[PDB]
């Protein structure tokens, strides 16, 4: 056996492990796949049109001659492969490098480690107590929020609607963390779904791994021994107002009294004007040193609802 010194390595509790993330995706119903790093430029140009890729002069074949600009070409070829073998429901992920030509990068090609995946088909397999329902945007977004919550920075994540040629323009979002775009997610555009011979609605995502390989180390904060109070409000705003900005305004404009803001209903129809929606929000209030009474409580939900008057619309 080797004789050597028993010296510890340098550890960082703020490191988030990729293997820990793969485990959560497994525990949410995702199967890991590994695909080739060189792909068919005919089909990658359908997913990323106009983006020049690094080509191999002497490839094993033309269908494996373009270094992948993302993981979507490999993942979407994998679901088509499985769907051609009597398996409509596929939920897979992959970690691996992308190769994007970059004059400022070493060797003129930037190689970023990505985490990407795709789901399609029904939410569950056939089940005696679960009904057949096709997967939608909020199913994949829920899984993505579970991944991002491992960093402890989910409060600083934003899903902004943003254009992407591969995605449904009304059901696609860019993912932002502390003002930096870290990935994309959305339903595959129906015409791209047609060209790739996808069986049905298909949802993809991709994340720049190094942007979420860091996590928050916990720091114990004092907990109030005094009870808390809940007040529900129903705010009617414009249909194109993102609900998260309203929730973020209630949490920011509110002082240290309000500790929790949660959305539990979104209504639009008989009762609300066209192009408008009612958002039912629950506000939880509490103080660390004393107990609250109806005077200061109702004055704070009144302060919050008045903040939604100029920036947004009135309540009901």
């Amino acid at each position: 056996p080797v004789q050597a010194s028993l010296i510890m390595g340098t550890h960082r509790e703020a490191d988030l492990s990729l293997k820990r993330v793969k485990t959560l995706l497994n525990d949410k119903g995702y199967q890991e796949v590994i695909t080739y790093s060189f792909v068919d430029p005919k089909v990658q140009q359908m997913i990323h049109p106009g983006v020049e890729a690094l080509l191999l002069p002497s490839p094993i074949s033309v269908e494996m001659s373009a270094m992948r600009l993302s993981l979507w070409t490999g993942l979407l070829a994998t679901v088509v492969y499985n769907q051609n073998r009597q398996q409509n429901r596929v939920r897979i992920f992959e970690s691996g490098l992308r190769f994007v030509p970059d004059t400022q990068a070493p060797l003129g090609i930037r190689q970023d480690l990505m985490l990407a995946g795709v789901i399609c088909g029904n939410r569950y397999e056939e089940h005696w107590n679960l009904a057949k329902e096709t997967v939608d945007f909020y199913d994949l977004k829920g899984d993505l929020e579970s991944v991002l919550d491992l960093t402890g920075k989910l409060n600083e994540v934003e899903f902004r609607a943003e254009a992407n040629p591969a995605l449904h323009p009304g059901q696609s979002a860019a993912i932002y963390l502390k003002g930096e775009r870290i990935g994309f997610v959305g339903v595959v555009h129906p015409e791209l779904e047609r060209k790739l011979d996808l069986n049905g609605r298909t949802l993809v995502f991709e994340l720049e791994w190094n942007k979420l390989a860091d996590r928050v180390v916990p720091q114990a904060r004092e907990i109030s021994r005094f009870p808390a109070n809940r007040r529900d409000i129903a705010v009617v705003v414009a249909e194109n107002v993102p609900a998260a900005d309203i929730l973020s305004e209630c949490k920011k404009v509110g002082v240290n009294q309000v500790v929790g803001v949660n959305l539990f209903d979104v209504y639009r129809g008989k009762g609300v004007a066209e192009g408008y929606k009612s958002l039912a929000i629950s506000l939880i209030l509490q103080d660390t040193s004393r107990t609250l009474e109806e005077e200061e409580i109702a004055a704070t939900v009144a302060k919050c609802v008045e903040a939604l008057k100029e920036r947004f619309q009135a309540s009901l």
């Binding site: 909020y138 977004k141 993102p242």
Partner: protein, 101 residues
């Protein structure tokens, strides 16, 4: 003249076609160009194959504009579906919360 004036009134009629009444303009202009084929009942017999080739070239030009308009309408219906399916991407996703150790 006539050879293109009838196609001018044909492509213009299939331009502002709201619904799928493109076939209604197809019906009217197919009868107009079939009637123009009946106008070849005279002329020099050695040039009658040249007359039928110019008329069918005009009919192909009308059929191309009909297909191009049918593609515009079905893409316009697909775009209308895409607009109606817009969702608030900032709404919370479906999941159970993560626990810790």
């Amino acid at each position: 003249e006539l050879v293109a004036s009838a196609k001018a009134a044909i492509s213009q009629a299939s331009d502002v076609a709201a619904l799928d009444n493109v076939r209604v303009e197809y019906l009217g202009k197919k009868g107009h160009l079939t009637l123009q084929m009946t106008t070849l009942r005279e002329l020099p017999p050695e040039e009658r194959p040249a007359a039928g080739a110019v008329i069918n070239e005009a009919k192909e030009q009308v059929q191309q504009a009909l297909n191009a308009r049918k593609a515009e309408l079905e893409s316009a219906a697909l775009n209308a579906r895409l607009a109606a399916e817009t969702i608030d991407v900032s709404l919370p996703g479906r999941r159970i919360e993560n626990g810790g150790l």
